[PDB]
Design a binder for this molecule. Sequence first.
Ligand SMILES: Nc1ncnc2c1ncn2[C@@H]1O[C@H](COP(=O)(O)OP(=O)(O)OP(=O)(O)O)[C@@H](O)[C@H]1O
Ligand SMILES: Nc1ncnc2c1ncn2[C@@H]1O[C@H](COP(=O)(O)OP(=O)(O)OP(=O)(O)O)[C@@H](O)[C@H]1O
Ligand SMILES: Nc1ncnc2c1ncn2[C@@H]1O[C@H](COP(=O)(O)OP(=O)(O)OP(=O)(O)O)[C@@H](O)[C@H]1O
Lengths: 527, 527, 527
Amino acid sequence: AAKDVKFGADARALMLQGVDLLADAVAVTMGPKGRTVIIEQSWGSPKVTKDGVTVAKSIDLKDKYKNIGAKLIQDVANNTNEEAGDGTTTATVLARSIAKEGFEKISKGANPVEIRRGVMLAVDAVIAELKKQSKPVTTPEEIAQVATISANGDKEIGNIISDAMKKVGRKGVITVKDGKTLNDELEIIEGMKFDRGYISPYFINTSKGQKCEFQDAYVLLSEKKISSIQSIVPALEIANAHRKPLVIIAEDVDGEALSTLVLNRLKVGLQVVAVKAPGFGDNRKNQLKDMAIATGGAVFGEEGLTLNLEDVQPHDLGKVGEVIVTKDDAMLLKGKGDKAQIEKRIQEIIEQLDVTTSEYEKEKLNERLAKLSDGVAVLKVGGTSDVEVNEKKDRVTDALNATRAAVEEGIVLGGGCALLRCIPALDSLTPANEDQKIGIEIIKRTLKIPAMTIAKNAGVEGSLIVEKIMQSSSEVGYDAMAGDFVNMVEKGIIDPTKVVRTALLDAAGVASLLTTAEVVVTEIPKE
Amino acid sequence: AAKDVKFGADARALMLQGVDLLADAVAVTMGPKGRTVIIEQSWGSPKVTKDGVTVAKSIDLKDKYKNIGAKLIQDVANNTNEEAGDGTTTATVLARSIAKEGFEKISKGANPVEIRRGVMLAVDAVIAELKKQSKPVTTPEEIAQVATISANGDKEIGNIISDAMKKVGRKGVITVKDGKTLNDELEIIEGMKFDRGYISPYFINTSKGQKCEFQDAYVLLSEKKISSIQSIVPALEIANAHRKPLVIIAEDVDGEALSTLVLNRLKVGLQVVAVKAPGFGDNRKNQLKDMAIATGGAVFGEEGLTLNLEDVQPHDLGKVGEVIVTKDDAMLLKGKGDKAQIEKRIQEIIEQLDVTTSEYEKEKLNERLAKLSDGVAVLKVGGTSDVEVNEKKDRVTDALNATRAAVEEGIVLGGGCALLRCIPALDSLTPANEDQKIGIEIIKRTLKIPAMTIAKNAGVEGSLIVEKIMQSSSEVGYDAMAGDFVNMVEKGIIDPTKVVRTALLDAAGVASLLTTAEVVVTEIPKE
Amino acid sequence: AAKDVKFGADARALMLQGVDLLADAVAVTMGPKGRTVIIEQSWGSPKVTKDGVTVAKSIDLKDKYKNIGAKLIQDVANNTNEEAGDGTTTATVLARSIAKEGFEKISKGANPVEIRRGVMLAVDAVIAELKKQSKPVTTPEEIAQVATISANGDKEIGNIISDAMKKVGRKGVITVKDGKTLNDELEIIEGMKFDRGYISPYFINTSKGQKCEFQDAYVLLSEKKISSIQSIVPALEIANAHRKPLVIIAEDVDGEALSTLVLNRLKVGLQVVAVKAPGFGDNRKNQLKDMAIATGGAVFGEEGLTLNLEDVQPHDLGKVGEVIVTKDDAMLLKGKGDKAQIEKRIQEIIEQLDVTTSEYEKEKLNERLAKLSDGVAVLKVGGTSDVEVNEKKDRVTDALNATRAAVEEGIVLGGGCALLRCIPALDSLTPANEDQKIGIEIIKRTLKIPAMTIAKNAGVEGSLIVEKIMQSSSEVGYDAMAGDFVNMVEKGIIDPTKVVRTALLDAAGVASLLTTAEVVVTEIPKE
Ligand SMILES: Nc1ncnc2c1ncn2[C@@H]1O[C@H](COP(=O)(O)OP(=O)(O)OP(=O)(O)O)[C@@H](O)[C@H]1O
Ligand SMILES: Nc1ncnc2c1ncn2[C@@H]1O[C@H](COP(=O)(O)OP(=O)(O)OP(=O)(O)O)[C@@H](O)[C@H]1O
Ligand SMILES: Nc1ncnc2c1ncn2[C@@H]1O[C@H](COP(=O)(O)OP(=O)(O)OP(=O)(O)O)[C@@H](O)[C@H]1O
């Protein structure tokens, strides 16, 4: 596969052209006054999006050289998204500025490696300054303000997010789902729910809603399948002797056992129900064990210390205040397990969370903890059409990620003033040689880009706005939407520290490396 | 794959061109004086259709940028069709008008998102006004008028639909089927007809029509296959002892039992007949249960509380006044069950219908309810060729959907006056800022489009007609077909509220979102 | 396939063009002030590499004739990289210089073969001079200096490598792996770790970290799978009688023995744990023998002297001070085996090393030796993105290779002065005839190329710098990074002798042979 090689300024110019194209495409979506971007899909309706990463990841150029810069900027945006979940457009603009300055400052005697060293030094100093400047979050109003700002200045989403986290705690489980109505909703699921329905409709006893209901019902857990008639008779004997319903959670119920259950329920009125055990693999056993602790019962069929169903006892069956089972989902509301073991199980789960880190394992552990502790909340966003629902879901997810980040770390002035306030810190550095001085100057000049872009999107001269902000007091910033200088903290225009620092770090790291190239090798295009 | 990017005015112009082409193609079929569109088909005779959604879906543009607008308008039309079943052309024209007005107002200082918010606020106010203006449907005359207007001014369609809904109630089951004669027909099916034929022709006892006819006949319902000769003798013995016919509905009849039945009938004249069970699986079980309840009999072979056929009893067999069985269908006319049991079964059916919604499940539950309660109505449309039959079926389906919507909610003045009468409600709004004022003005100017289009299709000046309508009383409108101003309600020109509000909402929602684009990303055409 | 033939100066010019292109692409990355080269990747992000062999291996030219020279230079670079691991760019530049000089001197009467003979003679003399000038490496500071120089002036890598070699000896096992933090980290592994996890979670006894810890635990080693319950019980009585925990390392634990162990641990609290054996095939058996020797136990199931598990003895069980086992890895820290046998094992392994040499076999034997003697060290390189991590990892690997080469042999002045100091040796040769004199002259003039290139990359006249170096004292060269003449050894600018001599030998060997061509036969391009 023959290859083409270009030397010197030509390759840099072409790469800069590609970077500028992608950055210009992504920059028009920045600020409260930004505008959306339409992407043409290959199978159906186009996407109308306002996310920087989504726009960046859907641009590939014909020329083989510009595509290199496009790919590098895509990597910057994707890394920022993966690390923080927000602040991708800021990363893109910062990377573009750094790349432009680096390409402009090269000369015959310059040493790009030392320039990169100086850039990294300046970035480290700026990040330290940001960490000094931060402040924690304590009030729900701050949470609501962060959520509102991250969601394109929409107040309803912020209020919904604040209510959700208030109800299920700040570090709970929250998810976004497609709605079917015009207006969004918040639904909170409490107790134990595992999305399974009764096997046979004959167990229905409450027609309204086609649901089966009990009160103070014995709970039976069986890890393995229930096949032999001899393996159930003691349980029904106990339930009928103590005049209490019985809910049978087992891997499955065989034809003979199911026939016995249904016939007894029909002809004697004995209150009994059966549901499939939830989860697959080790998750099934884990959930069964957790239910056993929650309801104070015992599980049958464990490989270790196996217990036989033929010798069930009244103390082995857990007690639950309420049980609801329908076509699709089942709910155990009020367990009766002892508190100490519940707390110990919670402690073990949280300890396990820190042991092994994988998205699936971590998510499963968090879901189990939420089920066993406080519950989960579901956000359903509505709209007139699918395009609207998707576009709103993007913003809602951005708001959730930003709010979580603001819970983890403090908050700083929004609107790009957080970076502008760090310029003074760069005047205390002592560059070792000339190249590090060049790098420090590059970072100092680049720190102003975000606020300038936000002002530019509003249709006003950004440079004058920045000049005015720098000379004003410490807490004064520019409110793009209103178009006047206000007290940032009071008005609630705030941003998490994690997002800002991650964006700056990733952008600088990638762009500085890019600016040291001298030769570019590509493949000749095929016919 | 390489991709192309366009900025600002060029993308807007191309997308507007595509939208204009699609809407111009679709809008020539609006109003009573509209003309048809011929769609070329790749496997037979072309379609000659006057339906907006079909024309919208049958258009794809060679260029990529215009295709985006075409696809968005297709989404609008499809959403309106699925939600309401009518009013697709109105939605298309409203979407075009909103898109054009939004594009005409974008400038450097403009803020498209706030314009969208203002548009949504205005649309909500207008829909509230419409719901205020709505009035309920009370008499069959309004049903006939709605059906007639929905079917492009065809009185026979309205009369047929009104008669059908009178016969089978206002919420019965009505289905449209192709015809084989010049004149359309209405057929009512009462009792329980399930389209199953006698297993052996030897049971026929009436030459004319080759139909098996019985009076005051026992019915034997079996969920399991009848094969054993032992299991079938007792029922025949009871029937012979009581000297009454007997119809067997079962999963299937085996060689031995079938041979016994046929030979007994032939050599002794015993009155018997057997048919397959209708439906499959759980549906079959439910159908058998419903017949058992209706006929006052008992079902054998049920998995829960199973009853075996060897111990059949006289009180376990239902009685039906009349039984008709032929090669294609079998009908049970007059059941002999308990009225309270029937009422409870209907209550359960409707309650289940109120639990979970799916087209298949809802359709099946409705079919069972109609069979057990009032029956169904079948409409057969006539024509000289398939093209005419399809073109008329389109209108008949539109009429059914419009009449159903009119039954569900109120009715408002037709001919576009319903929207024209809502303009004053927008004059009571107070925009928060300039952008919301621009959006409100956009909707205020858009609300006149339907009347203007209807007038234009008639060959007169739309603006003059709209102006004259606006200065008249609150009850006067324009009769497009006749060509004079009349009392809209008195002449019977009315439309459902649901159609109007759905069209307005969908069109505004999609168009306003479309009008906030700044960039378009599309794939370069391949080779 | 049709082929094309070229004669004389045409072919030489074409091949020289190809060689010049490749060498120009590769030489811009030489010295402390070099610049990086970007390679376009077919499936993802491009590489940003400052590695000579990587650049050379990724250039192919459309023209058939140039590809010959490109391929020959690729061969030079690959051979140098394989033999030494460093000094690829020096080899490439030397090869270009030799090829150009040889091509320049071919005439009607010249004899290329004799020129090659003279070139080889001069190269041998220069290599002898280098070996005479070398000195051994003694202090850790020299190791740090060599690592820093080879790592492109990065002191952190040098310090890390020096510390690692101090900890795990100067001939231990060091591996480079991708990290997950901003800063590179050094992790040292001691004892014996084979990355195997506990068979069943029930064995966990330390809640924090979900680990299993024992002190002074009996060790049972079984080459073959332990399945029959009778084959594991006697060890259990032994352990429960001596009141010590037992660790069962075997090929696998079947459901029977596994059930016995887990049940006893759960119900009686007996301290036991089991793990799979490491590695496959003969490696597994060798590892088991090594553990047996270290712990002082005996391996069960050996093909020779097959010792059945039914007769375990208190003295046949290994003893280990500490045991840690978790979901992924297990560790035995302080074995109680006899020292003398440990030595005999070590001498046996090292004796086996020298007999057979295959990369897999050498790696495995070295791993076993390190595990049994001193342990291993892991170098984790940090970074913000994949490109940065790869770029740093290249330099780290080059530093490791250079440090190993400098430990194996001596060190010589860096910056190209080592070769410059060897020119006087060539003045003592007496060419047999004219052609050998021409070859000696070619090598004499070529020896200056590395220093000239390094000076050129810094942005100064290379000729003046090399001339001033040659006329100065022996211990004075040019410091490119600072830009002044200094004492090379004192400043710590040194290189290994192996790298220099290998690069010179390979470059001369290939270029001299290339410079004796007269006809080039190439395949005609296809369609
Ligand atoms: N009303 C406002 N006035 C001033 N600055 C604002 C205002 N609202 C948001 N900002 C600032 O603008 C930026 C928010 O824009 P945006 O959400 O597009 O940025 P991003 O996080 O980089 O990208 P995205 O969220 O699309 O991935 C943040 O700097 C936020 O501080
Ligand atoms: N004789 C009439 N005079 C005035 N307006 C009329 C008359 N007949 C129908 N209309 C109005 O014209 C529209 C009916 O046309 P049409 O059926 O093409 O529109 P649509 O409901 O948007 O689409 P579709 O063809 O799918 O039903 C409705 O607004 C109806 O109120
Ligand atoms: N500060 C310095 N001043 C002078 N010479 C230096 C300095 N640092 C390194 N050198 C010399 O420059 C050369 C380093 O270049 P480099 O490591 O790129 O060459 P290479 O070993 O041929 O290639 P590579 O390591 O990429 O495979 C070596 O000769 C080293 O001795």
